[PDB]
Design a protein around this ligand. Sequence first.
Ligand code: YMZ
Ligand code: YMZ
Ligand code: MG
Ligand code: MG
Ligand code: MG
Ligand code: MG
Ligand code: MG
Ligand code: MG
Ligand code: MG
Ligand code: MG
Ligand code: MG
Ligand code: MG
Ligand code: MG
Ligand code: MG
Ligand code: MG
Ligand code: MG
Ligand code: MG
Ligand code: MG
Ligand code: MG
Lengths: 207, 86, 201, 128, 103, 125, 180
Amino acid sequence: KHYNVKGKKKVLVPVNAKKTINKKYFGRKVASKKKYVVQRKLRKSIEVGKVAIILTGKHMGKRCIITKILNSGLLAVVGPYEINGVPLKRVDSRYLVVTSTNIFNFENIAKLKDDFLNYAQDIDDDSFIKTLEIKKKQKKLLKFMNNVIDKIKEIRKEDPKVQKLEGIQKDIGSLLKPEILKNKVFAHYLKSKFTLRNDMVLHKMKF
Amino acid sequence: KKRLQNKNSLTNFAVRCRLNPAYKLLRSLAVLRMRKSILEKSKNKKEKRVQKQIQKKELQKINHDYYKGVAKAVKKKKKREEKKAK
Amino acid sequence: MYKKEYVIDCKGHLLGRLASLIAKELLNGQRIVAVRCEDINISGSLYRNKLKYQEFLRLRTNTNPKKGPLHLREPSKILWRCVRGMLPHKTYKGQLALKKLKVCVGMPYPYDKKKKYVLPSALRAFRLKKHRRYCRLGTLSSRVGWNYDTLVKKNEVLRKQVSKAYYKKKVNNLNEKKEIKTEALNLINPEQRQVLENFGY
Amino acid sequence: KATKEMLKIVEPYVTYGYPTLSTVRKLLYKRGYVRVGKVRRYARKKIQDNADISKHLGKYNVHGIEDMVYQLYTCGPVFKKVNNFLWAFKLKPPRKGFKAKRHAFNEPRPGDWGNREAHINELINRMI
Amino acid sequence: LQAVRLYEKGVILGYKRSQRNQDPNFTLISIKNVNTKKHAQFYVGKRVAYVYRTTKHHDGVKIKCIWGKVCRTHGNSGVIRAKFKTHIPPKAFGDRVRILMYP
Amino acid sequence: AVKKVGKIIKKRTKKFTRFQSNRFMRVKPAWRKPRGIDCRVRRRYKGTNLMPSIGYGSNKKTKFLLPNNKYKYVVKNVKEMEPLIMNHTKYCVQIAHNVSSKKRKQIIERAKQMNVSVINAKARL
Amino acid sequence: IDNSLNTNIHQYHIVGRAIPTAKDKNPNVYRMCIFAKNDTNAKSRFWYFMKKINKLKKSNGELLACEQIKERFPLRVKNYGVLLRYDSRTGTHNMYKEFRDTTKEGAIAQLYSEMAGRHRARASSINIIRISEISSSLVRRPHIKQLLKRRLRFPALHLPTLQKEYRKKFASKRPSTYRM
RNA sequence: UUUUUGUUUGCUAAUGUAAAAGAGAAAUUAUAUAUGUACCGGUACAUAAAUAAUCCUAUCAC
RNA sequence: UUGGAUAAGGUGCCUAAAUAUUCGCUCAUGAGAUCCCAUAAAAGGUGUUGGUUCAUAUGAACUAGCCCUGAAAAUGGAUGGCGCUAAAGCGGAUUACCGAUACCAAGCCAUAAAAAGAAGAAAAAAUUUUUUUUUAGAAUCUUUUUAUGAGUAGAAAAUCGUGGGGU
RNA sequence: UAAAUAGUACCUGAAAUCGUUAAGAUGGAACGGAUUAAGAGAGAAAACAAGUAAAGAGGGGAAUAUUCUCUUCUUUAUUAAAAGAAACAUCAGUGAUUAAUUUAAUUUCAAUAAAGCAAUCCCCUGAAAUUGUUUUCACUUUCUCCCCGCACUAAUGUGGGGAAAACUGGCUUUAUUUCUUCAAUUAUUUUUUUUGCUGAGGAAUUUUAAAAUUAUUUGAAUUUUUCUUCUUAUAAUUUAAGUUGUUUCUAUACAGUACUUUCUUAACCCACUCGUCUUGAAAC
Ligand SMILES: O[C@H](c1cc(C(F)(F)F)nc2c(C(F)(F)F)cccc12)[C@@H]1CCCCN1
Ligand SMILES: O[C@H](c1cc(C(F)(F)F)nc2c(C(F)(F)F)cccc12)[C@@H]1CCCCN1
Ligand SMILES: [Mg+2]
Ligand SMILES: [Mg+2]
Ligand SMILES: [Mg+2]
Ligand SMILES: [Mg+2]
Ligand SMILES: [Mg+2]
Ligand SMILES: [Mg+2]
Ligand SMILES: [Mg+2]
Ligand SMILES: [Mg+2]
Ligand SMILES: [Mg+2]
Ligand SMILES: [Mg+2]
Ligand SMILES: [Mg+2]
Ligand SMILES: [Mg+2]
Ligand SMILES: [Mg+2]
Ligand SMILES: [Mg+2]
Ligand SMILES: [Mg+2]
Ligand SMILES: [Mg+2]
Ligand SMILES: [Mg+2]
């Protein structure tokens, strides 16, 4: 579904009304009268195999390759764990500065694109959001120090969705790694963290 | 009636349409105009040039005439000055 | 003005403008060391400047000159005063800014080994037409009783020799580095080398 | 003639000129507020809908904003009434600012209060 | 190297101001090597954080931060106005601020 | 400044203190409106105390709502408690300052039965 | 196109005439070029001039035509002679000045500045009486004659006007005004 | 001096920073020219001439 | 109240905004610096900068800008200060910007006026039925709309509090 | 003694003023307002958890003494949810940016590569014989050449006097326009890159009706067009018909260093003793 007003063609996505609001002089009603919310529509630089810098996460500054446009707007990113250390990580388009460099532009890695695409497709949206039960379990560990952390980690590992995600990541790494390694400079770049220095003006940067 | 927003007509397409119904047609026309390829426009330029010649000449004559008049005026002024001096 | 401490070489500058430049920076939040304050130039003719100074001196407090306008006659001191004038020094922020400024005659202990900066929008060579009269601040100071001018000059001269010595060594080092670079450019990797060449290095 | 005289009398306090059609339309659209109610109790209501003006200006064969705009542009059979109906356009200050409100537009130095016949539209656009 | 920058450095200057009228609603920010209006505009949507240290711990820490949005450029010389979640303390007037790369 | 919490907007959290109440003991903070020539406050010079004015008033809709969103109702007795049986989500009980402890306890008990909030349950607790 | 260099003085050909009357069916039409910043200003100037010269006022006449004249060869250096009438604080004077420029409008702009600067003559107080292109054999003013030199050459002693990007208040090494 | 943990009866364990995120950068001098170098301030030869629009220094964990 | 955009004025720093651009003019051994405004004159000037009129590239006479002289009072001293001369001076022009409680857009408060008013299930959460909220109708009242809001002397209205009385 | 900080100056015991303690501040006032801040106190009635279950302590009401049911506190655990604050996204309102775009109109142009046309010539512009017009000589280069000065120049040149040409320029052409041009300023239009602030209200029939949009269906039109328009009919949607959604966080908390708020100093900016008579009071 889409609407084409003034020549924009905006594309609609079905949404659910969650918030309830008190009526003027009787019983409450749902806040949203609208049933379809216009899709995000990402910038004209976000692709499928470009390398991006994560600005805000724990892996702050790491250079990770983009994976899947994850339909919910925010995209999936991987810095092939066995090379960069970035896991199968969901991220918003804003918290990633995408570089003009594309992986599938290199002569060596371009041939393994279809497989990558397939893998990306296989990854889903609901496989990221942790179900409440897991959260509850995690919380339950609060009531020594490092032991608690360990327990939390274990719990995280246990999650079936999480396991699946991990597996997917591993598969991706297997697919991609050797080629990346072979392009040594590229590999190094992938590994390294992007840092601003006393010469990099940012506003004149075309990266 | 409870006042709602006050919706910009010039932008909010629907509102604009409501205000002025024929507007849609106009918009369509504009779009169509925008559409046409630049080659045609380029071609038309030659035609325009061809058509313009006489007009251009006329314009030149007019402007030339004006210039001449100005010159004459200047000359007259000079003459007057000379006379005064004398 | 995002540096830790800016050392400003005050030679060849035009006083008031320089002061103005300093003041804003100070306000913003920058430690400024105005060094070599004997060679700051004033845009008026020397005599005129002297006269002005005299006039200033004359305006003292009538009841008790222990208070009132302190006529600090050291060039650095003068500069400092000027800077203060262009500041809201009666508040707290202003005071802080003032404190942040440090003025020196010639070059002392640490500010010989630190990089000396120049303010191009305040230079005498860029702000005065070369048919107008200018005045060296040190000379002015001497005229209105400073005494320690010759000594300062001598010190400066001495320092210059040292600088020259150091400079020679630096030059040599640079040359060596260049040589090394030349040698090693062939020892890297072809593509990498090419890339380096492309990007100027 | 009378209008002209009036303008002259208040020349140094106003800027005026010939509005051009597009500008007028714009004014009607973004800044066009209208008086809706029984005479002397008006209420400043933004147009938005044609039924809002079709009640008062229905007798004079001018339904819709477009008609009103047309009337404004060229003094038709019914223009004065339309003008009356329209609330005084509460405009912004110019986005690039005035030259000088004290001096005239016709003054050789930068000014404003003259009869800017062809630049009035521009001014309006700036302050729309 | 321990720790990665990823932000442009800045100085949280005065409030938006007349000659003698305050306006605490906007702060003025000087961004390192940006000297013109055009350059300033690049940073317009970026997020700004004033991070500061305190003696008493709070959410278990000595460092807290106030966030802002960067609203508009400010006059010819690359300065920008920033609006913050809560107004900045004027103790901050000579302090450093961070302008992040996100949005 | 303004103090938004929920939809509850408070325009002026600061109390308007009497002019010079801070200068002479004999002048209490309780707002009094200054009269007479040369007031400075009356004249509204920059930098002085402000004058309370009708602009400051809270939206007709949320006015006497407390942070809880319930209008406070003072309660001296069970009988009074009763008018709010059909209003537990809109009025919240405060027990009168002069109520004896037993009576207060009783009132509290009643409130709990009614599901009505008590804003001062802890007095003499 | 540059928007900092431009001076918005244009030249307008204006034609107008007094409204016809029963007693004077065939009035006389008057034309002039007027140097002014916009078209309305030009018109006003024209009206003023009419008032000064003949019995005519804007109220009893009508503008017949307003043209706006663009320079025909806006990239050809030309030597302009100008005649002016100006008012000082002490009285009124006629004068002739010469300006080497690329358009009449530009010359006018130059002239206005010159009068402002050298005589403290404000725009209001000046009346341009004729600007015409002078051949190089009739150049009377030395500051224009000099320019008209054969293979003219001069060095560039002017101070660099850096862009407010590459303008910094702290400099590494003391800049040089010498250049070359 | 090095290490560890901390500064989460008026007291007797104890916190503060107008400014860390690479807060990097030592010729000198002239401004209608300077700097070296080599001889005897002079001569000859180089060299800077948008000079921080630069250079240096980063990420190569195990 | 929030955001915007201006006005007068400014934009070297104090001081938010130009050491902006652009063309001139000024050097002062007591420069000059913007309405009211906080003063300067007659008369000069082979100071420089333009001009005009004349004469044979000089000699005149004039003329007007800036500048200089004329220009001397008492506490110390005041373009507001610092300072400023390729101005940050004077006269322009060109942009850009900053800049009010003025303007615009939005909210809320009051006042004024205007519309208008003597019957009914909505949703969510649970698991087809329970639970959670409301389920309005107070005429100086309720709902909505628009405009407006300075104020001494003064007038009025609505409230608020104190001592007692009947209820 | 119930109570002596009810001890006969005796009920309550305010303020000024003073003492002790603590905290803080302090360069010729102090206080204050506006806005934060860091402290230091306070707090939970929005600032999370309804209910369900197991079993204690209580209380009730009803049905016809003891069945039922309603509950308030305690607990062991057990799932909500909502609520605010973020962040991002989507609208809409109002703005700030940097790119543009339509058909025009207004003596614009500029290249292209072949023909030419005239040499003080041409587009022009001068000086001369009320507008148009006739002719007069005046005006371009040059790294060209000659003669004089013989390197005389700021100049890798030159002062002067002369020659040359059409490379330069100008015009006239034949075509050409992404090699480069297609301006500028209005006219009328159509977008777009970033983006800041705002979200009021809650519509028992004007939160409808229409507009718009999507997929269909009938008939037309000259603007032959995947946004072509009207219109016959049907569903849906939002650009209508003022902000909702997603994910965090507070937090699986009962108060903590978080959150609220009172006080406290700071700090930036401002702020002159009130009353009073007065044209006018901060008034020496
Ligand atoms: O501002 C002028 C001035 C002052 C002083 C200072 F106060 F620093 F000594 N120095 C000045 C100088 C200085 F000598 F360069 F410092 C030159 C011109 C004027 C000066 C004086 C002040 C009194 C009135 C005008 N002349
Ligand atoms: O106007 C009706 C009405 C009727 C009657 C009755 F007829 F019973 F006396 N009395 C009313 C009253 C009443 F008089 F107070 F009883 C007030 C308001 C409306 C009334 C309203 C109509 C709406 C529903 C409530 N009664
Ligand atoms: Mg202005
Ligand atoms: Mg008075
Ligand atoms: Mg008084
Ligand atoms: Mg405002
Ligand atoms: Mg502005
Ligand atoms: Mg400033
Ligand atoms: Mg001075
Ligand atoms: Mg100034
Ligand atoms: Mg009033
Ligand atoms: Mg007792
Ligand atoms: Mg007692
Ligand atoms: Mg008693
Ligand atoms: Mg007693
Ligand atoms: Mg040719
Ligand atoms: Mg709402
Ligand atoms: Mg003050
Ligand atoms: Mg009197």
